[PDB]
Amino acid sequence: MRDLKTYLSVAPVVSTLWFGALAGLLIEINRFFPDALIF
Amino acid sequence: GEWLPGLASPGYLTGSLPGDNGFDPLGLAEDPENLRWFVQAELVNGRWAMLGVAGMLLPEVFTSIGIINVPKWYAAGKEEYFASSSTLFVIEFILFHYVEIRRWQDIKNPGSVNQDPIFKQYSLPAGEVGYPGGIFNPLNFAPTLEAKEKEIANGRLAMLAFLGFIIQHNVTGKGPFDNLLQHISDPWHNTIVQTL
Amino acid sequence: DISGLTPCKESKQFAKREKQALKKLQASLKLYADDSAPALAIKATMEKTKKRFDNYGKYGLLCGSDGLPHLIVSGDQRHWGEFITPGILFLYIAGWIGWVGRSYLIAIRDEKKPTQKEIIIDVPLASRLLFRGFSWPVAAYRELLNGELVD
Amino acid sequence: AHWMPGEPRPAYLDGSAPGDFGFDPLGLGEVPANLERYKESELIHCRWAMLAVPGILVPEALGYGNWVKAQEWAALPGGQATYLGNPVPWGTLPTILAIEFLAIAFVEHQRSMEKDPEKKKYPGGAFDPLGYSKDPKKLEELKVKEIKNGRLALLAFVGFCVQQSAYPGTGPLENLATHLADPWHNNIGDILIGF
Amino acid sequence: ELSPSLVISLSTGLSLFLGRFVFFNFQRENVAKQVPEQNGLTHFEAGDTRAKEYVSLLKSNDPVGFNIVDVLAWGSIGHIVAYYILATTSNGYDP
Ligand code: CLA
Numbered sequence: 001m002r003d004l005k006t007y008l009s010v011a012p013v014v015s016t017l018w019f020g021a022l023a024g025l026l027i028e029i030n031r032f033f034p035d036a037l038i039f
Numbered sequence: 040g041e042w043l044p045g046l047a048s049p050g051y052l053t054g055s056l057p058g059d060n061g062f063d064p065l066g067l068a069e070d071p072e073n074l075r076w077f078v079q080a081e082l083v084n085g086r087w088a089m090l091g092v093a094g095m096l097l098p099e100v101f102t103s104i105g106i107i108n109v110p111k112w113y114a115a116g117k118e119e120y121f122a123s124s125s126t127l128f129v130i131e132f133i134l135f136h137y138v139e140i141r142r143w144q145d146i147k148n149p150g151s152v153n154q155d156p157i158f159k160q161y162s163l164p165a166g167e168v169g170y171p172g173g174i175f176n177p178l179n180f181a182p183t184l185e186a187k188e189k190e191i192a193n194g195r196l197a198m199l200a201f202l203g204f205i206i207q208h209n210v211t212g213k214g215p216f217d218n219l220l221q222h223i224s225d226p227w228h229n230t231i232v233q234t235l
Numbered sequence: 236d237i238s239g240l241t242p243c244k245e246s247k248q249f250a251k252r253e254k255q256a257l258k259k260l261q262a263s264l265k266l267y268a269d270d271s272a273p274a275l276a277i278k279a280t281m282e283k284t285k286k287r288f289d290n291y292g293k294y295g296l297l298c299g300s301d302g303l304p305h306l307i308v309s310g311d312q313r314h315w316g317e318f319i320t321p322g323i324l325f326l327y328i329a330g331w332i333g334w335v336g337r338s339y340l341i342a343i344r345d346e347k348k349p350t351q352k353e354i355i356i357d358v359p360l361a362s363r364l365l366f367r368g369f370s371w372p373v374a375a376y377r378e379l380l381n382g383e384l385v386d
Numbered sequence: 387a388h389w390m391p392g393e394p395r396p397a398y399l400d401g402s403a404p405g406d407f408g409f410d411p412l413g414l415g416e417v418p419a420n421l422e423r424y425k426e427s428e429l430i431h432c433r434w435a436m437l438a439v440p441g442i443l444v445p446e447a448l449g450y451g452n453w454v455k456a457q458e459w460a461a462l463p464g465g466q467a468t469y470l471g472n473p474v475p476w477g478t479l480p481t482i483l484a485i486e487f488l489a490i491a492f493v494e495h496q497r498s499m500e501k502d503p504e505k506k507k508y509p510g511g512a513f514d515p516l517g518y519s520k521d522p523k524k525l526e527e528l529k530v531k532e533i534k535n536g537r538l539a540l541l542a543f544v545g546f547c548v549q550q551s552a553y554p555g556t557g558p559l560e561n562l563a564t565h566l567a568d569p570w571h572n573n574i575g576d577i578l579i580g581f
Numbered sequence: 582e583l584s585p586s587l588v589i590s591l592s593t594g595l596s597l598f599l600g601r602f603v604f605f606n607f608q609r610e611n612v613a614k615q616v617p618e619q620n621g622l623t624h625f626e627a628g629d630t631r632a633k634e635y636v637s638l639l640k641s642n643d644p645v646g647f648n649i650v651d652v653l654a655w656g657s658i659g660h661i662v663a664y665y666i667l668a669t670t671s672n673g674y675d676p
Pocket residue numbers: 389399403404405406407408409410413414415416421423424425426427428431537538540541544
């Protein structure tokens with residue numbers, strides 16, 4: 001379990017989760033505040 | 040003091056300062072000089088916030104009870120004065136330049152600035168940085184630890200209150216006391232929820 | 236106006252672009268049952284479109300002879316949202332990221348095997364250093380004056 | 387006595403020089419030779435300013451003229467100048483330009499040939515008929531007075547030029563009167579935080 | 582209208598006077614401080630046979646040493662200033 005957590009903390013997994021979260025965020029923001037060219 | 044019971048207070052907050060409740064989660068005052076400068080800044084922002092908030096709420100309360108017709112703080116600058124806002128700004132800028140540079144020199148070097156440059160006979164007694172005293176304290180109140188931490192407390196409360204005033208005016212478009220009254224009117228139907 | 240441009244709310248070509256766009260969308264919409272999903276989709280596109288043009292007009296954007304929004308980045312105060320403000324926001328976030336990363340690299344620099352925590356992230360440490368970025372201008376400004384920024 | 391109370395003065399400024407108030411934020415006088423040259427040139431700028439300032443104010447009050455309008459007679463085919471109201475015969479641009487050039491070049495270059503650093507700034511001799519420099523202590527006191535009046539004159543000149551940039555075609559004394567009109571309305575504000 | 586001869590002669594006279602009396606020492610001093618050389622030795626010591634300084638031509642029985650070269654130099658400046666003044670006063674320029 002500790003080993004599995006360590007694996008989940010490895011660079012590619014961390015990157016997939018981080019950029020996944022970011023992608024989700026930017027997507028939702030661009031869904032609620034769409035076509036933003038100013039601000 | 041424990042702002043978050045029971046979160047261990049940072050090592051650099053040993054309670055040797057008034058207002059030490061161990062609240063610095065981002066570690067801004069990890070450096071001693073940083074802690075000094077931030078103590079000064081907290082005192083100054085705090086005092087100006089107390090004065091400002093008082094000057095924002097109090098005139099409005101007296102207007103509500105019909106004592107004196109005073110225009111609200113966010114509509115007070117608009118072309119009502121004798122000397123105009125620009126001249127007022129130049130004056131303000133000059134006097135504040137002098138005063139703030141003076142205090143700054145006090146912060147950089149405590150004993151360096153204490154005597155009147157014109158009338159060198161008069162002088163200010165060697166005290167604490169941020170707590171000048173002397174002529175600034177004509178009623179000779181004792182700068183006790185309790186009084187200091189009370190000062191800092193009311194200062195923090197007033198700063199948060201100023202942020203509150205700004206945001207509330209930004210949203211509702213009325214005065215803070217007006218918002219308070221409307222909140223008293225119907226508490227469960229007049230909050231930030233309904234105004235947004 | 237600025238650079239010989241004309242305001243989008245007053246631009247004829249801007250309006251004609253909105254027109255042709257909406258008319259293209261409707262010309263495509265004609266082939267589907269009004270209650271069906273394709274219809275609702277195309278209609279959503281139409282509403283989104285006109286809302287977009289209306290918002291651009293409202294924002295005080297200047298249009299060229301092409302009928303498209305052109306941006307003013309000279310520092311002109313009527314257009315700070317066209318570069319200055321989102322620029323400040325960007326700089327804030329980027330500074331946040333860089334400062335946090337810097338903190339992390341410094342934190343593990345003095346250890347048995349530093350490279351380890353560079354290929355296997357210390358998530359507790361990272362979460363502790365995460366929010367420190369919020370005050371990055373203040374933190375960096377003080378480190379600049381102190382001499383803890385460079386060697 | 388320094389310019390900023392509580393601020394440490396540079397290592398090379400002990401205050402033994404006339405007007406030495408420890409003002410050098412940029413550390414331009416860190417080099418001794420440069421510092422000496424700066425003393426000389428500061429005195430030169432000072433004396434030029436002290437001659438200029440009243441020469442800007444006086445003909446505006448008495449001669450009813452203007453230190454900027456007094457420039458405009460040139461730059462045109464006419465080229466006629468007036469002194470105390472009286473049109474000068476040799477008062478044309480090329481002539482006075484040649485005269486000024488030759489004279490000032492001669493005197494300046496003659497000042498350039500001096501080797502003694504103390505006489506390069508304080509020549510004396512023929513330039514001191516009243517012998518006010520004969521007494522050392524009085525010389526020092528009068529030196530301090532000179533550098534101070536000179537610096538104030540320089541500041542006044544800056545005032546004239548900036549006030550001219552803000553209100554073109556109007557002299558300093560005219561601006562003083564305008565200020566005396568409505569002191570609380572006629573200020574720098576209209577230029578700074580205006581409009 | 583300005584007499585070309587008077588302007589030119591007066592200008593050249595002023596320049597030659599300035600070079601003979603008021604700027605002579607300074608010029609001679611700065612020239613004394615400078616002399617072209619490659620790798621320490623001069624161009625003639627290197628040596629290019631065509632880079633020897635003319636001793637004969639520079640000779641003069643003038644009290645200070647004002648020779649033909651100085652005459653050509655300050656004279657050149659004089660003529661330049663002269664023709665500048667002439668051409669300038671000749672035009673109908675108005676700003
Ligand atoms: C331009 C002529 C000039 C020169 C050559 C000097 C030279 C000197 N002054 Mg200074 N002084 C001047 C003008 C000048 N001053 C003016 C106008 C004032 C009134 C503000 C003063 C007030 C003053 C004080 C109180 C003191 C000095 C001192 C000195 C000496 C040490 C400082 C130094 O080394 O800087 C060398 C200076 C320069 C190399 C000048 C360069 C200027 C740069 C290139 C451009 C500056 C642009 C300017 C700021 C624009 C004007 C803006 C306007 C609004 C002010 C040095 C001999 C100190 C001293 O020991 O005196 C004996 C001292 O205590 N001066």
